[PDB]
Short mmCIF file of C-alpha atoms and ligand atoms in Angstrom, two decimals:
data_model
loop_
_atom_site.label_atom_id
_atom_site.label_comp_id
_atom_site.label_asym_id
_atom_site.label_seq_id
_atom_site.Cartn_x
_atom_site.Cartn_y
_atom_site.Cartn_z
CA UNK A 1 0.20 -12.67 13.18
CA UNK A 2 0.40 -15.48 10.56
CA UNK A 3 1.99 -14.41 7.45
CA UNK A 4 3.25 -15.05 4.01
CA UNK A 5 4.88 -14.00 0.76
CA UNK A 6 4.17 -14.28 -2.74
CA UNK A 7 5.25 -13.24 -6.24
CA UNK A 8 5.23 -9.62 -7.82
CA UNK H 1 13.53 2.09 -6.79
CA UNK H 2 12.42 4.00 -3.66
CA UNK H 3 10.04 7.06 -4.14
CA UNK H 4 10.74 10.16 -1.90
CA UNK H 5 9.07 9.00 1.01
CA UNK H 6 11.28 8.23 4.13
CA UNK H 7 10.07 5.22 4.81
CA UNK H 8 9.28 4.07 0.96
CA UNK H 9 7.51 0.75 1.06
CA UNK H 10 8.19 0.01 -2.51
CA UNK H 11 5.30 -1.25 -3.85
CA UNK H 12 7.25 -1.57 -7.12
CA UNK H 13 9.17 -4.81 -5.45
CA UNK H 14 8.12 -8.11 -6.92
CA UNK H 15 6.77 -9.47 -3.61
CA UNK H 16 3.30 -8.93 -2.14
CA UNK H 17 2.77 -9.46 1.87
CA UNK H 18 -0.10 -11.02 3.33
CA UNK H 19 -1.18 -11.11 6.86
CA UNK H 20 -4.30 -13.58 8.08
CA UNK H 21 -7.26 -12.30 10.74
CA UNK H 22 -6.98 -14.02 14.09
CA UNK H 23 -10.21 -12.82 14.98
CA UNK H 24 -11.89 -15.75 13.66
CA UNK H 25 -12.90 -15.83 9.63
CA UNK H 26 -9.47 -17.03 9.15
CA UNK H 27 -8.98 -14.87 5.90
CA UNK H 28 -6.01 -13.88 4.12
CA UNK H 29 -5.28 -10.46 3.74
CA UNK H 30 -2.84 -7.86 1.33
CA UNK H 31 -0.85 -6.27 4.22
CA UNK H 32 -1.37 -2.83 2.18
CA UNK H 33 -5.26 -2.90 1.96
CA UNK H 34 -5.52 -3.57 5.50
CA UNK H 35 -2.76 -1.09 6.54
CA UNK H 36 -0.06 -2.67 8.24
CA UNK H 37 3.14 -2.55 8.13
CA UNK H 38 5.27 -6.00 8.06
CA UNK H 39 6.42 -4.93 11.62
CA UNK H 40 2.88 -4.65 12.85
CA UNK H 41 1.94 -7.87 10.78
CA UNK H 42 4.54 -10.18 12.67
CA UNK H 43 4.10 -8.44 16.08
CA UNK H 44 0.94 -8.37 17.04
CA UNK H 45 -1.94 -10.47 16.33
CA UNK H 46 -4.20 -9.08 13.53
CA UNK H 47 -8.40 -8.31 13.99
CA UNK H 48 -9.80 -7.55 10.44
CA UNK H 49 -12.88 -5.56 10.47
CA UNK H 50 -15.51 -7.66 10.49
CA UNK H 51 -13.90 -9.77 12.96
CA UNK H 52 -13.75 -6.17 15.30
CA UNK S 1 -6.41 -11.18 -7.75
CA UNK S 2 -8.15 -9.87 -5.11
CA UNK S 3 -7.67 -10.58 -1.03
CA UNK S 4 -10.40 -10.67 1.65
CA UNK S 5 -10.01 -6.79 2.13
CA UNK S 6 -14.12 -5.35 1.25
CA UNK S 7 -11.51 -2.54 -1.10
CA UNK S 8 -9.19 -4.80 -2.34
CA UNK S 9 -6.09 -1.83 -3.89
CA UNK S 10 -4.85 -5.00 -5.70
CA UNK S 11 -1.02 -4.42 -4.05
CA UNK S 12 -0.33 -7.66 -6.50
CA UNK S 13 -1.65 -5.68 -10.06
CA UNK S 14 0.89 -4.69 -12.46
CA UNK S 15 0.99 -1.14 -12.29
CA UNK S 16 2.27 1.48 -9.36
CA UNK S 17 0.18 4.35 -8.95
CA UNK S 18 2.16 7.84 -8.11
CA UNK S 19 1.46 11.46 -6.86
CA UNK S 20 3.55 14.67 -7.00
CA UNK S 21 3.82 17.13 -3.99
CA UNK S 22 2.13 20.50 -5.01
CA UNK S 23 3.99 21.76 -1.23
CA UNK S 24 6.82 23.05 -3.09
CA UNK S 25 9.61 20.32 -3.07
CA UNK S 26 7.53 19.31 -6.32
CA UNK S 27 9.27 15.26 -6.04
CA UNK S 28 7.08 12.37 -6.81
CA UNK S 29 5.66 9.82 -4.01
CA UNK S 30 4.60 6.16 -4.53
CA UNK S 31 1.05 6.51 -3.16
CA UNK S 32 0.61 3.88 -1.05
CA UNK S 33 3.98 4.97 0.57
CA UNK S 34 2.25 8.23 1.24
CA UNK S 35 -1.52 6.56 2.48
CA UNK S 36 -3.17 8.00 -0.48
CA UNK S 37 -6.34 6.44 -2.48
CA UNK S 38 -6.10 6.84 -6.16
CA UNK S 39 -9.55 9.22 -5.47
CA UNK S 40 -7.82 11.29 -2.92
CA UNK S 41 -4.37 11.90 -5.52
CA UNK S 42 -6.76 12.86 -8.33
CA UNK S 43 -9.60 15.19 -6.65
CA UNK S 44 -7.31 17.34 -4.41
CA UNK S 45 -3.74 18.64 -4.17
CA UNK S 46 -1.07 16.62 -2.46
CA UNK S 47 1.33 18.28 0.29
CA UNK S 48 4.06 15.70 1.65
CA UNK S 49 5.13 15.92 5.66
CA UNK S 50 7.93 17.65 4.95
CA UNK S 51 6.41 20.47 3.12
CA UNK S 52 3.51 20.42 5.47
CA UNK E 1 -2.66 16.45 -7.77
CA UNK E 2 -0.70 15.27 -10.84
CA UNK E 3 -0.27 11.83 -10.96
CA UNK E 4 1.10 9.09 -13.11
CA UNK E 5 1.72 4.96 -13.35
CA UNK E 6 4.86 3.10 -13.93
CA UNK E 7 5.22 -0.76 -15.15
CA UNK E 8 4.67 -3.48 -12.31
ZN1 LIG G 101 10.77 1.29 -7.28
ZN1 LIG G 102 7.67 4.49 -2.13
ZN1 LIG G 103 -11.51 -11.62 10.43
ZN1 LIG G 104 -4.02 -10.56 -6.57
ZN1 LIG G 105 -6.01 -6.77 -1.28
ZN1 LIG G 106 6.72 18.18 -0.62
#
């Protein structure tokens, strides 16, 4: 599936 | 730092993962409150509940 | 902030939650490492797999 | 159980 990081 | 857990997931890491439904609201979703693991997340194609 | 999740655990907050295994090996878990709601580590006892 | 939060 689509997918993404982010911060903390 | 990794709890005792075998397979710690460290939520203490400075990253949050995200996973989006394919079932058709096209949401974004914490990979933790959905339950699934990054493996599951980039294998498979991902149904939210309401979607279901 | 929260995701599209209905209960949101807020993976993103600035805090980790933990729980302690009352099984006997008495170490400390991350508790989303272990599946466990902040409701479920505070209303009953915890027992990890391997003390299970 | 006994539990407890850390920073982050
Ligand atoms: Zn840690
Ligand atoms: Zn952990
Ligand atoms: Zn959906
Ligand atoms: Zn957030
Ligand atoms: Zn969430
Ligand atoms: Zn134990």
């Amino acid at each position: 599936a689509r997918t993404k990081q982010t911060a903390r | 730092s990794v709890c005792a857990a075998q397979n710690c997931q460290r939520p203490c890491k400075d990253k949050v993962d995200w996973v989006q439904c394919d079932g058709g609201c096209d949401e974004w979703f914490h990979q933790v409150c959905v339950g699934v693991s990054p493996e599951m997340a980039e294998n498979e194609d991902y149904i939210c509940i309401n979607c279901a």
